[PDB]
Structure formats: C-alpha cells, structure tokens
Design a protein around this ligand. Structure first.
Ligand SMILES: *CC(=O)c1ccccc1
Ligand SMILES: [Mg+2]
Length: 230
C-alpha cells in the first residue's frame, strides 16, 4: 500500500520557466552594460552545466557550487568580462524573487500531507535545497527532504532513494516517486521497487513513457493514481 509520495524538484515542483527567467536575471546582473548578449551567456552557461551534470549522474556527490563557479570562470575568460566573485550571492537573491512553483503544487502537497509521507528527493546541496524550499514557501509541507549530499551520490544512484525510504520508514513498494527525468527519476526510483510517475507537462517525452509506471501532465493526477493503487 502506498504510504509515501516523493517528489523531484526542478521541473516537478518549481518551474523550468521560472528557472530560465531567474537565470537570465542573474546573467543580466553579472554583465551590466558589458557588450555581451546576456541570453548568449546564459545559453553557453546552460550548455556547459548540462554537460557537467550529465557526466556525474549516478556518481559520487561533488559540490555543485564549485562546478558552477568554474564554468563562470571559464566564461568570464572566454568573453572578457569581470568574473563575479558574488556570483553565488547574486544567484540566491534572484532565486528568492523569481523562483516559481507550478500552479498546482501547494494544492497537491496539502492534499497529501498528513495522509501520506510527503518527501522530496533532489540532486542538490542540502543547505541550498532547504533555503530554496523556504524561499518558495513550501519547506513546511514536507515530512522529509533527502539530497545527493546526504546520500553521497547523485540520482539515479540507489542510495539516494534508499535513504529517503529509510527516513520515511517505508518499503520501496509502499512509495511513489514523481519526477520529470525518465532516466534519473523513473528509472532510478524503480530500482528500489518504487512506483514511478513521469511528469511530462508539455508531452515532450513520449519517446520515454515506457520507462515509468504512470505518466501525468499535472501533479493533481498523482493523488488519483495513489488512491486508485490503494
Ligand atoms: C538557478 C539559481 O541560481 C538558483 C536556483 C535555486 C536556488 C538558488 C539559486
Ligand atoms: Mg527534475
């Protein structure tokens, strides 16, 4: 019986659109009137960071701040603008203002909280995850928050899911994982026996739907699935 529902972060609870808007504002503040299109800087930053994150999926945890700051160091040297020593602090300030939840998130978390264990499982440093949940106003809505930093490994490594399950006191088969990445979220959680729900908000991933037990475009569908399973 489903006793716990676990959620991914980016693309699942906080929007990619807010992420992109937030990060453009970060680059605009980095650059000022430097003669570089902030959108061009952002696209190159995203290209490099995506490659780095891909390299480390499933692998031992390493600090994301060191990776992002090195990428920025490279980009500052490539393009000739002054490296921002306060890059991280700029980023935090912009997260607090421009971080954005999908419209149904609070409704969904509220409807589940109390009746099931409500958890988050995220690739993130712990302090950074807790700060952003606070900034979005949803920290209190979780019974557990489990991170790659705690487990020692990035998704889809089994230990990050194992830890979340152990925090909640449930078996994998008594738990659901909702996330937007078919490999890291659906495939990763399945290795622990969890029921996997792929969130495909824009229907962009039908190539990979077979990788999940269920497909949804809106998190309000989750509660119906759990009830139906129970
Ligand atoms: C994208 C970014 O700068 C960010 C995101 C979440 C929390 C803090 C910073
Ligand atoms: Mg995600």
């Amino acid at each position: 019986m489903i006793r716990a529902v676990f959620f991914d972060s980016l693309g699942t609870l906080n929007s990619v659109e807010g992420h992109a808007k937030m990060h453009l504002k970060i680059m605009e503040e980095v650059l000022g009137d430097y003669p570089l299109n902030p959108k061009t800087l952002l696209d190159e930053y995203n290209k490099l960071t995506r490659e780095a994150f891909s390299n480390y999926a499933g692998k031992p945890y390493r600090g994301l701040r060191d990776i992002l700051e090195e990428v920025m160091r490279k980009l500052a040297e490539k393009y000739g603008f002054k490296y921002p020593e306060n890059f991280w602090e700029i980023s935090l300030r912009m997260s607090q203002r421009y971080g954005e939840l999908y419209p149904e998130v609070v409704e969904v978390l509220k409807s589940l909280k109390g009746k099931y264990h409500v958890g988050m499982i995220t690739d993130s440093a712990t302090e950074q995850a807790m700060a952003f949940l606070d900034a979005l106003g949803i920290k209190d809505l979780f019974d557990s928050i489990t991170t790659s930093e705690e487990a020692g490994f990035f998704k889809p490594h089994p230990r990050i899911f194992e830890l979340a399950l152990k925090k909640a006191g449930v078996k994998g088969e008594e738990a659901v994982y909702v996330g937007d990445n078919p490999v890291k979220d659906a495939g990763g959680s399945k290795n622990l026996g969890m029921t996997s729900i792929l969130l495909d908000r824009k229907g962009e991933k039908r190539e990979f739907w077979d990788k999940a037990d269920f497909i949804v475009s809106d998190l309000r569908e989750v509660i119906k699935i759990v009830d139906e399973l129970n």
